[PDB]
Design a protein around this ligand. Structure first.
Ligand SMILES: OCCn1cc(-c2ccc3c(c2)CC/C3=N\O)c(-c2ccncc2)n1
Ligand SMILES: OCCn1cc(-c2ccc3c(c2)CC/C3=N\O)c(-c2ccncc2)n1
Ligand SMILES: [Cl-]
Ligand SMILES: [Cl-]
Lengths: 261, 262
């Protein structure tokens, strides 16, 4: 089992928030990340998420997926993963303006696909892939996290495929919803910025993207962005679910992109 | 469940030998290390070794334990882990005589203790700790592996073998403290860049002597910048008497203090 008996985890500093709780740095057999639900009496629903996420996380063992290390139910519900030195992709790209070399950008991308291919072969849909959820350990290895909105067969507007934004379908979530999210992550990597920067109105972005009036301006990729890469982005950011590639194909594509650079 | 269906693992190069098998680089959701038993008809002793090692690795999820990813039963019996770009600590210290800095050597020791602490807490005895089984993922992160010989409470790798393990006279010759002696030898390698008993060329004699207590690692050979507390820890972990050796909670703290003062 992976239940860490109450008292073993040492909760240090509050880092931020996760799918269904607050993230703190912690100590359990070393440095760990701790995602804790702070309520005293967990709501049945809340408890449900914990169980789901944990059940989802028990089925992951991959270099590019945040290593779930265990869980805790008392004093409070908590999810313990490894600790990633550095920050999330969102942070690197949009807060501290880390300027990565293009070959490093393609590496980050390939790794994210490596992890997402893993997830999909396992019938896991992340349902909330964003830069905020892609952590770069030792500014080298990409690990994906926050698997609470995940599931097995948001406020994250910018990564949401138009059929998800529309929400006018049944589980508008698909391996392609994830693929679109990933394609937006690709935009961020090769643009250095967030989609739709020239619009200041969240509602407006939401509507247009949902009705297909708005799309990421791929004309902003850096000059060094392999064209193949621009074309792959386009394939992933297609406004029609079935016109988008799955992760084995995306992986094969990026790896070829790598052979020549 | 961790069974990987037939056909999904792509076996690449032969990388070397494992405890009960042959290690290859491979591909399964990315670069993976694969250890395969290269036999046609697997005896029940090897099927037992396999079910044992799978059972232990399932319980390991720690940055300093080599990431188990899954097992296959066809084409062959196999264990699949993450792929560690770099090489074993042994390779670095004795093959390419890599020159890590003390700060790094201490960090490598901290991480190996971190990994060792994780296992011993889940009641796992590694039973074959050695530089050969410590891999340097990106020359940064220590990943401990080869849990073939490992077991859960209730070889030919002599230099890491505690005296009582060499003798095989006591019951349960192996114990948390056997792996602490193994760790003590790994500390030695880190602090001398060297193998113990490097001036003796007879395996049988080294076995006998360490077994009787005639022989022990020369500690005056630690590098002159090795902190006094790291040498003191090294010798605590290397005490001939099993129960006079620390456990990894004490060991980790010690190193973590050494750190603060460096
Ligand atoms: O983006 C906000 C900052 N931030 C949030 C997390 C985080 C998010 C989700 C989850 C965990 C940690 C652990 C449990 C979990 N759910 O999977 C991290 C983090 C992740 C890994 N190592 C270090 C830090 N940073
Ligand atoms: O020592 C000879 C060289 N060598 C052996 C391994 C090895 C050893 C044992 C086991 C595995 C791989 C995989 C399964 C296993 N048993 O747990 C490795 C290695 C480990 C991790 N990443 C890259 C290489 N190098
Ligand atoms: Cl597991
Ligand atoms: Cl012992």
């Amino acid at each position: 089992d992976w239940e860490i008996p109450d008292g073993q985890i040492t909760v240090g500093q509050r880092i931020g928030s996760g799918s269904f709780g607050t993230v703190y740095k912690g100590k359990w057999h070393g440095d760990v990340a701790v995602k804790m639900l702070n309520v005293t009496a967990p709501t049945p629903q809340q408890l449900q998420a914990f169980k789901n996420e944990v059940g989802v996380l028990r089925k992951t063992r991959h270099v590019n997926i945040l290593l779930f290390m265990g869980y805790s139910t008392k004093p409070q519900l908590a999810i313990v993963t490894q600790w990633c030195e550095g920050s999330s992709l969102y942070h690197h790209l949009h807060i501290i303006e880390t300027k990565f070399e293009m070959i490093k950008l393609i590496d980050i991308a390939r790794q994210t696909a490596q992890g997402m291919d893993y997830l999909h072969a396992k019938s896991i849909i992340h349902r909330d892939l964003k830069s905020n959820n892609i952590f770069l350990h030792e500014d080298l290895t990409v690990k994906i996290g926050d698997f609470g909105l995940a599931t097995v067969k948001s406020g994250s507007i910018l990564w949401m495929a138009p059929e998800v934004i529309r929400m006018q379908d049944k589980n508008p979530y698909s391996f392609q919803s994830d693929v679109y999210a990933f394609g937006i992550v690709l935009y961020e990597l090769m643009t250095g910025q967030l989609p739709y920067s020239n619009i200041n109105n969240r509602d407006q972005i939401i509507f247009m993207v949902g009705r297909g009036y708005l799309s990421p301006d791929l004309s902003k990729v850096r000059s060094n962005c392999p064209k193949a890469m621009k074309r792959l982005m386009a394939e992933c950011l297609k406004k029609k679910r079935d016109e988008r590639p799955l992760f084995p194909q995306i992986l094969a594509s990026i790896e070829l992109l790598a052979r020549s650079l």
